[PDB]
Amino acid sequence: TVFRQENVDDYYDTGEELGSGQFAVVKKCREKSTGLQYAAKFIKKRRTKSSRRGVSREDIEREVSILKEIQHPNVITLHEVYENKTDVILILELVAGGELFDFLAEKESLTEEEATEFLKQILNGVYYLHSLQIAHFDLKPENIMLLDRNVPKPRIKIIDFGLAHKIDFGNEFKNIFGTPEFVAPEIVNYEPLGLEADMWSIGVITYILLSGASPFLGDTKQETLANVSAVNYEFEDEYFSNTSALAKDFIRRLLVKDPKKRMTIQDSLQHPWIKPPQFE
Ligand SMILES: Nc1ncnc2c1ncn2[C@@H]1O[C@H](COP(=O)(O)OP(=O)(O)NP(=O)(O)O)[C@@H](O)[C@H]1O
Ligand SMILES: [Mg+2]
Numbered sequence: 001t002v003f004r005q006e007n008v009d010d011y012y013d014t015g016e017e018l019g020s021g022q023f024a025v026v027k028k029c030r031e032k033s034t035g036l037q038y039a040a041k042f043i044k045k046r047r048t049k050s051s052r053r054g055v056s057r058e059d060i061e062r063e064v065s066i067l068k069e070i071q072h073p074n075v076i077t078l079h080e081v082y083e084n085k086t087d088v089i090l091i092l093e094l095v096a097g098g099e100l101f102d103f104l105a106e107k108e109s110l111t112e113e114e115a116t117e118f119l120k121q122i123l124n125g126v127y128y129l130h131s132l133q134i135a136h137f138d139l140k141p142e143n144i145m146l147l148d149r150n151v152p153k154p155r156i157k158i159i160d161f162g163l164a165h166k167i168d169f170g171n172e173f174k175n176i177f178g179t180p181e182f183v184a185p186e187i188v189n190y191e192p193l194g195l196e197a198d199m200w201s202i203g204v205i206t207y208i209l210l211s212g213a214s215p216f217l218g219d220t221k222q223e224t225l226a227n228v229s230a231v232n233y234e235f236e237d238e239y240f241s242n243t244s245a246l247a248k249d250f251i252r253r254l255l256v257k258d259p260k261k262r263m264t265i266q267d268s269l270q271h272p273w274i275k276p277p278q279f280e
Contacts, residue, residue, distance in 0.1 A: 001061060001064075001065075002083070003064075003081040003082055003083040003088060004080065004081065004082045004083070005082070005083060005084065006082065007084075008040070008082045008084075008089050011031060011032055011033070011082075012029040012030060012031050012032065012038070012040065012091070013029065013030050013032065014027040014028065014029045014040060015027065015028040015029065015030070016028045018039055019099075021160075021162070023043055023044060023054075023055050023162060024041050024042060024043045024044070024162070025041075025042050026039050026040065026041045026042075026092075027039070027040045027042070028040075028094065029091070031091075037094050037096075038079055038091045038092060038093065038094050039091075039092045039093065039094045039095065040089055040090070040091055040092070041089070041090040041092055042087045042088075042089050043055050043060055043063075043087060043088045043089075043090065044086065044087055045057065045060070045083075045085070045086060045087060045088060055162075059162075060088045062164070062165065063090075063161045063162055063164065064078065064081055064088070064090065065166075066134055066161050066164045066165075066166065067090065067092070067161050069132060069134070070128075070129075072124075072125060072128040073124075073155070073157075074121050074122070074124055074125030074128070074155075074156060074157055074158060075125050075128060075129065075157060075158045076092050076093045076095065076157050076158065076159045076161075077092070077093045078090060078091070078092055078093075079091040079092065079093065092159075093157070095145035095146070095147060095157045095159060096147065096148070097145065097146030097147050097148045097149035097150075097154060098145065098146060098149050099141065099142050099143075099144065099145055099146075100118065100141045100142075100144035100145065100146065100156065101140075101141035101142040101144075103146060103149055103154070104141055104208070104209070104212070108212040109210070109211060109212040109239075110209055110210065112210070112243065112244060112247055114153075115206070115209040115210050115247075116273070116274065117153050118144075118154075118156060118209060119202075119205075119206060119209065119274070120274060121155065121156045122139075122144060122156060122158065122202065122205070123202070123265065123268055123269055123274065124269075125156070125157070125158040126139070126158070126198055126202065126265050127265045127266070127269060129158075129164075129198075130195045130198070130264075130265045132166075133166055133167045133168065133195070134164055134165070134166055134167070135164065135165050135167050135172075135193065135194065135195050135197060135198055136158065136161070136163070136164050136198050136201075137163035137164055137165060137176045137178060137187075137193070137197060137198070138160055138162065138163040138164070138178045138179070138182075139158070139182065139198055139201035139202060139205065140178070140179055140181070140182040140201065140204075140205065141205060141208065142160075143158060143159050143160040144156050144157070144158060144159070144205075145157055145159050163176050163178055165193075167194050167195060170194055171192035171193060171194040172192065172193055172194070173192045173193070175190065176193060177277060177278040178201075180216075180221045180224040180225050180228065180278065181204065181214050181216060181217050181224055182201045182204050182205070183197070183200075183201070183225075183228060184196070184197040184199075184200035184201065184228070184259065185200075185228055185229045185231065185257045186259055188225050188228050188229045189229055194259065195264075195265070196259030196260075196262050196264075197259065198265075199254050199262050199263060199264065199265065199268065200254060200255060200256075200259075200262060202254055202268065203250075203251050203253075203254025203255040204216070204255070206247075206250060206251050206254070207233070207251055207255075210239075210240070210243055210247060210251075211236070211239035211240060211243075212239070213236065213239055215233035215234075215255070216228045216232065216233055220280055221278070221279065221280045222279075222280060229257075231255060231256075231257050233255060235248055235251075244273070246272055246273040247273055249271075249273065250268070250271055250273040250274065253267075253271070254268070
């Protein structure tokens with residue numbers, strides 16, 4: 001599909017940089033006609049068929065097509081798309097309270113209540129996506145953002161649809177790979193991937209929310225990946241001695257190597273704790 005090829009600067013003024021990855025720089029912006037504020041994500045296009053710099057049009061089109069489908073309080077929405085010869089420019093809903101990652105950085109470990117108030121939101125965002133057969137494939141504390149960081153119970157949105165895929169057949173085999181600390185063993189072993197892989201990432205996120213520690217992290221990327229495939233983690237007493245046994249049970253049911261035996265998004269919401277390119 002093609003996108004609007006007008007100069008983006010003719011319709012928006014850009015401000016502060018919000019963030020960066022591989023593939024993209026994200027800038028705060030303001031639409032001239034409405035005075036509303038957005039996050040403009042500039043994704044660099046591939047300059048030649050075989051190049052490794054930039055993102056293939058197929059991958060950009062998949063991100064845009066998934067984003068266009070979304071409308072849920074706990075996920076980011078897509079406002080408009082522009083393009084020019086160098087970039088595709090997604091105008092996304094602005095999430096202005098920073099990454100869950102940075103929130104967790106200053107001050108590092110949450111109460112079970114604070115942890116479950118975030119988690120319940122993440123779970124209903126992911127329930128929506130999975131209901132739509134969308135696997136996010138990049139869930140991690142940097143890809144969650146808070147609408148306002150200065151409120152006692154902040155409200156979150158899932159961002160970064162750069163690896164997301166529609167799962168039409170219950171699994172796909174296109175060979176996706178995110179960040180070693182958060183990927184499920186099936187990603188590590190290059191096996192067919194489905195919605196289950198997001199549920200593993202949620203367990204890793206939950207462990208970190210409760211402890212401030214990463215369950216699989218080794219000293220190098222390859223060692224983390226080995227730990228992940230072996231399900232090499234444990235609940236350190238120093239971190240978990242006063243954490244409830246149900247919280248551990250929740251995590252233990254997500255960090256399961258066989259995706260068929262791992263809790264589904266629906267199971268996670270009924271659980272008693274809750275229920276009211278890749279190398280060194
Ligand atoms: N809607 C948004 N509002 C506010 N900040 C955002 C938004 N989208 C992205 N960011 C910030 O920009 C960073 C990069 O955007 P992201 O969508 O994560 O890019 P990417 O490079 O394609 N994927 P990755 O390599 O995993 O970062 C994020 O980590 C956030 O800090
Ligand atoms: Mg990202």
